[PDB]
Amino acid sequence: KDPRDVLKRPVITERSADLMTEKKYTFEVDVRANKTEVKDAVESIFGVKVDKVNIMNYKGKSKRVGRYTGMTSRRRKAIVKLTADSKEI
Amino acid sequence: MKRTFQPNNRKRSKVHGFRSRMSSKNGRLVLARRRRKGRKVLSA
Amino acid sequence: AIKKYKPTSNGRRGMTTSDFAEITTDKPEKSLLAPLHKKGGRNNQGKLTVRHQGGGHKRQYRVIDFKRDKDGIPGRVATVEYDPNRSANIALINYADGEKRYILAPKGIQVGTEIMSGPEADIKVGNALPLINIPVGTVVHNIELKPGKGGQLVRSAGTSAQVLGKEGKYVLVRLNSGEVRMILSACRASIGQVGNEQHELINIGKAGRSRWKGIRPTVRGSVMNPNDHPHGGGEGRAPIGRKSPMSPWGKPTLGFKTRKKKNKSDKFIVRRR
RNA sequence: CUGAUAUUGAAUGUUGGUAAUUGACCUUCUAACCCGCCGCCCUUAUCGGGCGGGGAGACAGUGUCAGGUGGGCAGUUUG
RNA sequence: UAUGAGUAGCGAAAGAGGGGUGAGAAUCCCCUCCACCGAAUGCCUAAGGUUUCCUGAGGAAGGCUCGUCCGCUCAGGGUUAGUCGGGACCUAAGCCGAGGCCGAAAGGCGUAGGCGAUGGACAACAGGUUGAUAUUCCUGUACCACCUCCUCACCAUUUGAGCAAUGGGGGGACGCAGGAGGAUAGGGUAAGCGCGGUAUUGGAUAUCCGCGUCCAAGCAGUUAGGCUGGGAAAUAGGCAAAUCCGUUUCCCAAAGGCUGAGCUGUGAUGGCGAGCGAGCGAAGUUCCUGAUUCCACACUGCCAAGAAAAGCCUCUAGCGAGGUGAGAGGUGCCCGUACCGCAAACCGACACAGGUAGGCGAGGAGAGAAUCCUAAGGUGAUCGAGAGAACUCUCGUUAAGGAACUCGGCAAAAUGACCCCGUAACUUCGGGAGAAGGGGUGCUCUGUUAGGGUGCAAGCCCGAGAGAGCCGCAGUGAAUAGGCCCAGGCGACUGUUUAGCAAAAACACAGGUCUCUGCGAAGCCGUAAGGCGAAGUAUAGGGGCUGACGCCUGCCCGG
RNA sequence: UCUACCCAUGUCCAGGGUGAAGUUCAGGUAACACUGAAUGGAGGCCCGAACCCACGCACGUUGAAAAGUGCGGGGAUGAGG
Ligand SMILES: [K+]
Ligand SMILES: [K+]
Ligand SMILES: [K+]
Ligand SMILES: [K+]
Ligand SMILES: [K+]
Ligand SMILES: [K+]
Ligand SMILES: [K+]
Ligand SMILES: [K+]
Ligand SMILES: [K+]
Ligand SMILES: [K+]
Ligand SMILES: [Mg+2]
Ligand SMILES: [Mg+2]
Ligand SMILES: [Mg+2]
Ligand SMILES: [Mg+2]
Ligand SMILES: [Mg+2]
Ligand SMILES: [Mg+2]
Ligand SMILES: [Mg+2]
Ligand SMILES: [Mg+2]
Ligand SMILES: [Mg+2]
Ligand SMILES: [Mg+2]
Ligand SMILES: [Mg+2]
Ligand SMILES: [Mg+2]
Ligand SMILES: [Mg+2]
Ligand SMILES: [Mg+2]
Ligand SMILES: [Mg+2]
Ligand SMILES: [Mg+2]
Ligand SMILES: [Mg+2]
Ligand SMILES: [Mg+2]
Ligand SMILES: [Mg+2]
Ligand SMILES: [Mg+2]
Ligand SMILES: [Mg+2]
Ligand SMILES: [Mg+2]
Ligand SMILES: [Mg+2]
Ligand SMILES: [Mg+2]
Ligand SMILES: [Mg+2]
Ligand SMILES: [Mg+2]
Ligand SMILES: [Mg+2]
Ligand SMILES: [Mg+2]
Ligand SMILES: [Mg+2]
Ligand SMILES: [Mg+2]
Ligand SMILES: [Mg+2]
Ligand SMILES: [Mg+2]
Ligand SMILES: [Mg+2]
Ligand SMILES: [Mg+2]
Ligand SMILES: [Mg+2]
Ligand SMILES: [Mg+2]
Ligand SMILES: [Mg+2]
Ligand SMILES: [Mg+2]
Ligand SMILES: [Mg+2]
Ligand SMILES: [Mg+2]
Ligand SMILES: [Mg+2]
Ligand SMILES: [Mg+2]
Ligand SMILES: [Mg+2]
Ligand SMILES: [Mg+2]
C-alpha cells in the first residue's frame, strides 16, 4: 500500500495547534491503519523522525439536516510526536 | 420494581442476533421472511 | 462410632453423626482426584428426569480401583479416608512398585496392612481373588459380574455377600439383598464386609443436612392438583381414592413388580429376595 | 404384557397324526444376532470402527401380524 | 371539535436578600448568610445509554410555571496505553462439533477438536497539566517480552556446549467457622514544630485562637513469621525414556530450602505542602489509637470433604554447531478509554417518591455501617404569592374516667440502653429466661483513684468501685433501643407458598413405614441414538403414604 | 433479558450475646464412672443494622407508582442473599 493512503488530512484545531508547539502533529488516518503504518508513512512522506504515535478512534456523530437523520463517518486520529533532533513537518 | 426488560447486549446478540438466526433452518426462515417484507433490520 | 449431639437447639435435637474414628487423614491423594460437577437430575436434553436431586456440597471424584488387577504385587494400606461420593470409606494403597490406588475400605482394615490381588493370594480381609479361588462361606464384597469389568455388587457401607457353592463355570453367591445368584467363577471379589457399618444409624437431624447431601424436598402426590399427579385434587385432605396408590406417571406403586419379564439374567437368579 | 412369523442355524432324545414320513417339547452345540466386558490398532479419543479373546446365543433385539391390559393420553356424549 | 372547566393537577425537600445580565427575571449568573445529605444525597466503577461531555451562540417546540437557562436547538471542539480492562494466554458450566451413531424428511445425539469468564495467569509508579483525557499526555524514576548492526565474559563443536517437548512428574489447586498474633491503611491531634492572629460585647499574652504538620513503584537490605525434615542407594509403577516423580531400605536430625505482610535505606540536590501572591513557599517529627484490609485459609476446629487448564519448575525423549550470561542499542500491534452510572443520561411510555452488582465510606458520643449532629465532598429538589374556613390527610397535646369502644384493644399509648439484685410452673434437662419483679445511672471534688495497655522514662490511652458534696420537675434528661402475664386450639421446630386481595392450621422437614430395584437396576426423558439415575450398586437408588419427640397404632382378605 | 428450578463461577452479611462437644487441671475411685474449675467456640442458636422478605394499619385508588409510600413487622452463617 501507498503511504499517502494512510494519512488522510491534517487536523487543524486549537488543540492540534497547541500540540504543534510540543512538536506533535495530528492527522486523520485511514480507519484501518495501525500506528506502525502511520509512523512508517509519516517518515516516508515528510522525511522526519518519529518518537511515538498515539492513536484513537472517534465514532460517527449522529446528525440532522431537516427531516433526515444520519451519521458522520468514523475517524481515526493519530498524534505523531517527532524526535527532538528532527525537521518539522 | 424490577421490570421485564433488563438490557444486556451479549444476551441480545446470542439469542436474537444474526448468527443465532443463521444457525437453524427456522432462524433462516425468519431472515427470509424479513427480507421478503423488506425490513431494514433483519436481526438483533 | 455414632456421636449423639446434645439438644442445644430444635435443629440439633435427635441428630447423630459419625465420629469418623476410622479416618486417618483429611487430605486426599491429588493424583487420584478427578472433577465432578452436579447435574440436578437433568439429562442431556437439559430436562429433569429424576426428581429430588439438586445442590449440595461441591465434591471431587476419587478414582477407586474396583478391578483389583495388580496381581501378585503387594500393597500397603497407607490411609483410610472419607470419600464424599459413597457411603464406604476408601483406603489409599501404596503398591511396592510405587503405584498408588484407592480401594473400598473393608471392615477391620488398618494402616500398614499388606493387601494382595490375584489367584494365589490369602483369604485375608482386603485381598481380592477370582471367585473360583474363594472358599465356600467366605464373606466378600465388590463382586464383578463380567470378568475384567470391575466390582459392581456389594460396595455400600457395611454390605456383604457370602459364597454358597461352585458349579464349575459359575459360583453361587448370596448377595446383600438376600438374592442368591450365579456369578461367573472368573469374576473377582474382594474379601470381607465393606466397612463404615454404622452409616445406616445416622439420624440426619435437620432439613438443611439433607440439602447439603444434594436432596431437594419431596412433595407428596396427594397435595398436588389433578393435572400434576393421580393423587392430586380432592376438597380438604383426601385418601388415595384409587384402586391402587399410583406413581406420578400413573403406574401402580405399591407391590407392582417392575423387573422386566423376559430378563436375560433370569437364568442366573436361583432364589429371588 | 403375551403369542405367531421373519432375521434363524446345527445336533440329541422325548412325545401327538401317519409304521417309513411331519408337528410339539426338553436338552446340548456355535457360526448368525447381541455385549453399557478385556487386550491390540486406526489414535493425542470412556464416540465409532477394525482385529483377537471372553460372555451370551438361535434366545434376546428389531420388522410384520395378533390377543390382553391400559383416564397414562385423545376425541366426544352425558335428552 | 366540544362538555366537564379556567375546574383536578403541576410528582416527597429551605430559603432570603444584595448585585448583574437582559426586550422581559420568584425561577439564569455572582455574592453573602441560612438550610439539607454525609455506610450518602459523597468519591470510584459495572451493566446499560451513546455524544447526553466542553466552548460559543440560541429560545419555536421539549421543560408540568417562567426562562436571558437547560440533559433542549445550532455551530465548532473533545476520548492519546508494551505495563489499566479485553484480544494476539488458560480453562469451567454450557455451546459448536471432522469422521461417527440414530432418525419419514427437517433433523437429534456425540468423539477428536474447538469456542466460552463470572474464575486462573500476567510488566508502572508518584507528581503535574486542559474548557473538555490521563496508571494513556508531560516530568521524574522504573519494569516486562522479544531482537542483535555491536561490546565484554564464559562454555563448547558429536563422551558435544546449549536448547528442550505438543510427552512424564511437580506445581498451580482452592471449603466453612473460630481465635491469637504481626503489620499496615485510617483516626486523634496528645506533645513538639511551623505560619498567621491578640480580638472592642464583660474577660483573656492566655492550659489563648485559626491553619498545616509528608511521599510511590522500583532497586538493595531486613523481618513477625508461616510451610515443609534432609542425604545416599535400589527400584514389577508414571503408554516411550528419565539423573525427575512414586515406593522401599539404610544413614543423619538440627540443618537446609520455599515463601512472607511490612519495615529500613535509596528513589528524593525531587515532588507535595499552611499560606503569600503564573510564581514563591515554613514546618513536615514523636506519641496514642487502630481495622470490616493485609500476612492468610496461615493456624486450630469441623463435616457437608471443598473446579479445571495454562503460565511456572523439573525430567528425559528429542534437537544441536555454535551456544550461555551481562552490557549497549533497539522493537512493542489491535479493541475500550468522552460523559451519566442510587440516576433528569440505565430499566420503569414521563426531567416518574419504584428497581439497579461491586470498591472506598471520616469525626463526637457509641458495641456499631445503629442513632443524632457534623467533615471531605455534595445539595436547596423546575410553579409561586396569600389566607390560616369546613372537610380530608400527616403530626403534637388533653380535664375526669380507663376498653365502657369494637366482630376483635384495630389504631394509639405503654415497654425499650447499660450495670446490679432477683426470677415460677413445666421440661425433651438444652431450656423456659430479657421469665416475672425490683434497684442504680447527671455533675463536682477526693483524682492524672485502684487497676490495666503502651513506653527506658516523660507522656499518651483505657478505667472499675468507693467516699464526700452539688443542681433540676426530671440524669441512658435529645435521637435510637423488648410490653408483660395466665390458659387453650392447630402445626413439633428454622424454612416454603397463591409476583399483584389468602403466609396459614397449607407445603417442606428430620423421623416412621410400605413397596419396587441384582445393575444395560428400577424409575424417568427421548421415535431412536444418547442420557439422567450414577462415574452410584440394596447401609444404594426410585415411588406411595405418614410427619420431631413420647405412649401407642385394635378387628375385617367377603369386595 | 420477567419468573420457576437447575448448572458453572464470583461476591455480600455493622455490631453485640449465649456458651455444645472436646481439652486441661484438680478431685475422684483398684480401673472406670462421676464431680468442679478453667479452657474451648458448636448452632437451619439469640438480639440487632446493611441486605432480603412482606405480617398489621393508614394513605394512595383518572396514583408520585398498572402493586407503591409511611409507621411499625419477620429472617439476618443459612434449607441465606
Ligand atoms: K432435629
Ligand atoms: K413431603
Ligand atoms: K386435596
Ligand atoms: K444511617
Ligand atoms: K443559553
Ligand atoms: K492491554
Ligand atoms: K508495582
Ligand atoms: K521503598
Ligand atoms: K479516560
Ligand atoms: K402451601
Ligand atoms: Mg488506544
Ligand atoms: Mg425421591
Ligand atoms: Mg392444593
Ligand atoms: Mg389424572
Ligand atoms: Mg384423589
Ligand atoms: Mg373431607
Ligand atoms: Mg378424557
Ligand atoms: Mg370437534
Ligand atoms: Mg378561578
Ligand atoms: Mg388558578
Ligand atoms: Mg366542578
Ligand atoms: Mg375546587
Ligand atoms: Mg389545586
Ligand atoms: Mg416539584
Ligand atoms: Mg452541559
Ligand atoms: Mg414554558
Ligand atoms: Mg488482560
Ligand atoms: Mg453435538
Ligand atoms: Mg457431520
Ligand atoms: Mg473475568
Ligand atoms: Mg497487571
Ligand atoms: Mg472529566
Ligand atoms: Mg472518565
Ligand atoms: Mg427517579
Ligand atoms: Mg439490591
Ligand atoms: Mg458514623
Ligand atoms: Mg385524657
Ligand atoms: Mg390525667
Ligand atoms: Mg365491650
Ligand atoms: Mg357496645
Ligand atoms: Mg396494635
Ligand atoms: Mg409451623
Ligand atoms: Mg417461620
Ligand atoms: Mg397474593
Ligand atoms: Mg415471595
Ligand atoms: Mg399478604
Ligand atoms: Mg437405553
Ligand atoms: Mg451414565
Ligand atoms: Mg399429613
Ligand atoms: Mg397429623
Ligand atoms: Mg390400622
Ligand atoms: Mg438464627
Ligand atoms: Mg435478628
Ligand atoms: Mg419497612
CATH architecture of chain B: Orthogonal Bundle
CATH topology annotation of chain A: Alpha-Beta Plaits
Characterize the largest beta sheet of chain A: strand count, sense, and whether it forms a barrel: 4 strands, antiparallel
Number of strands of chain A: 6
Give the N-terminus to C-terminus distance of chain A in angstroms. Answer: 22 Å
How much strand of chain A? Answer: 35-45%
SSE series of chain B: HHH
Q: Give the CATH level 1 class of chain A.
A: Alpha Beta
Q: H/E order of the elements of chain A?
A: HEHEHEEEE
Task: Find the CATH superfamily of chain A.
Answer: RRM (RNA recognition motif) domain
Helix/strand/pairing category of chain A: alpha+beta
The number of distinct helices of chain B, counting runs of at least 4 residues, comes to 3
Bound molecules: potassium ion, magnesium ion
Number of domains of chain A: 1
Rg over C-alpha atoms of chain B, rounded to the nearest angstrom: 12 Å
Name of the CATH class of chain B: Mainly Alpha
Strand content of chain B: under 5%
What's a concise summary of this model?
The PDB classes it as ribosome. Chain B has 44 residues and is mainly α.
Any descriptors?
part of a larger assembly; 3 chains; B: 44 residues; mainly alpha; Helix Hairpins; 3 helices; C: 273 residues; mainly beta; seven-stranded antiparallel β-sheet; four-stranded antiparallel β-sheet; 23% strand; binds potassium ion; binds magnesium ion; RNA-binding; ribosome; Stalling; Nascent chain; elongation arrest
List the helices and strands and how they pair.
This is part of a larger assembly, with chains A (89 residues), B (44 residues) and C (273 residues).
Chain A: H1 3-6, E1 7-10, H2 14-21, E2 24-29, H3 35-46, E3 50-58, E4 62-65, E5 68-71, E6 75-82
Antiparallel strand pairs in A: 1-2, 2-6, 3-6, 4-5
Chain B: H1 9-16, H2 18-22, H3 25-37
Chain C: E1 2-4, E2 16-18, E3 33-36, E4 59-62, E5 75-81, E6 90-95, E7 100-104, E8 114-115, E9 128-130, E10 139-141, E11 161-167, E12 170-174, E13 180-184, E14 188-191, H1 207-212, E15 269-271
Antiparallel strand pairs in C: 1-2, 3-4, 5-6, 5-8, 6-7, 9-14, 10-11, 10-14, 11-12, 12-13, 13-15
Bound molecules: potassium ion (K) (10 copies) and magnesium ion (44 copies).
Chain C binds three RNA strands through strand 3, strand 4 and helix 1.
